[PDB]
Amino acid sequence: TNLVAEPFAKLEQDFGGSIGVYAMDTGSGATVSYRAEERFPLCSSFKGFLAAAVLARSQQQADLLDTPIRYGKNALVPWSPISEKYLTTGMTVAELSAAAVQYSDNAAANLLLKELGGPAGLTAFMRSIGDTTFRLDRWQLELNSAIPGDARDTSSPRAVTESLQKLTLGSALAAPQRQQFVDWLKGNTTGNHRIRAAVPADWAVGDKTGTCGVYGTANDYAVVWPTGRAPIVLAVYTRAPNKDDKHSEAVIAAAARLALEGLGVNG
Numbered sequence: 361t362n363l364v365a366e367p368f369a370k371l372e373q374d375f376g377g378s379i380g381v382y383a384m385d386t387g388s389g390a391t392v393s394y395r396a397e398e399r400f401p402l403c404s405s406f407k408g409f410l411a412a413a414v415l416a417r418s419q420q421q422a423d424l425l426d427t428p429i430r431y432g433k434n435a436l437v438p439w440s441p442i443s444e445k446y447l448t449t450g451m452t453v454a455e456l457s458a459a460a461v462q463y464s465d466n467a468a469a470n471l472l473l474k475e476l477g478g479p480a481g482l483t484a485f486m487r488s489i490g491d492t493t494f495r496l497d498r499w500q501l502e503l504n505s506a507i508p509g510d511a512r513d514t515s516s517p518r519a520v521t522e523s524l525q526k527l528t529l530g531s532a533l534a535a536p537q538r539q540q541f542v543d544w545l546k547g548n549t550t551g552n553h554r555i556r557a558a559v560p561a562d563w564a565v566g567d568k569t570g571t572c573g574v575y576g577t578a579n580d581y582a583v584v585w586p587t588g589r590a591p592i593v594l595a596v597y598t599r600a601p602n603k604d605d606k607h608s609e610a611v612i613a614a615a616a617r618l619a620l621e622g623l624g625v626n627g
């Protein structure tokens with residue numbers, strides 16, 4: 361980290377808030393860390409871990425992913441771009457999971473959170489893989505309040521990265537479910553201006569974004585596969601002191617670039 365600690369501080373000072381980064385080179389175990397153990401709001405980024413928890417359950421329930429789910433108009437909350445198109449038909453659990461990951465579909469996320477036993481059930485899943493930091497406490501959209509100092513609905517960049525590595529590259533999911541989780545992340549549509557903007561076009565990447573809409577709070581986490589070397593797992597989270605401070609995608613991309621530079625990944 362010492363290779364880039366000064367550029368990280370300058371970046372967050374220009375941003376006018378706080379930036380949290382953890383990045384892990386899964387080959388050597390080398391890391392880059394900046395505010396890595398501070399809590400930041402998850403915002404919509406909890407939905408990636410939600411889809412992983414669904415996949416974990418599907419290991420014990422072979423009919424889960426194909427199960428149709430029907431929902432009423434009152435389930436459709438703002439930014440439900442996929443589930444609004446299937447209001448009159450329903451969608452399967454797998455389809456809802458893909459929509460939650462790849463479009464950050466809010467109705468889909470709420471339906472899946474219900475299936476898993478709510479915020480505590482997702483928290484329990486994260487505990488089961490060894491993440492003692494993650495906490496989900498509320499539902500979409502109350503969980504995005506991003507109040508300064510409020511630990512509800514937060515994690516740290518380090519724990520996000522550690523859990524993402526276990527789920528995408530480690531043994532937390534069985535191999536078929538692991539590849540499905542990776543495929544959903546690779547198909548994300550909402551992150552082109554964040555970690556992906558720091559990653560060369562010939563490298564594979566999967567990610568999940570979050571944007572709370574207040575307190576300069578937004579984030580992205582990703583697995584990146586540079587060619588010819590082991591994958592990199594990283595998390596970039598931001599917040600800022602004032603409710604109407606705006607988030608910045610460019611700052612997230614810039615922080616990801618610094619993380620890769622610190623790890624010595626030529627990009």
Ligand SMILES: *C(=O)[C@@H]([C@@H]1N=C(C(=O)O)[C@H](S[C@@H]2CN[C@H](C(=O)N(C)C)C2)[C@@H]1C)[C@@H](C)O
Binds near residue numbers: 438463464501550569
């Ligand atoms: C999650 O953080 C919110 C929902 N998830 C996303 C996403 O792409 O991760 C969008 S936030 C994205 C950033 N700029 C736009 C915005 O903030 N809007 C539309 C208000 C779109 C979506 C809102 C969740 C809190 O709803």
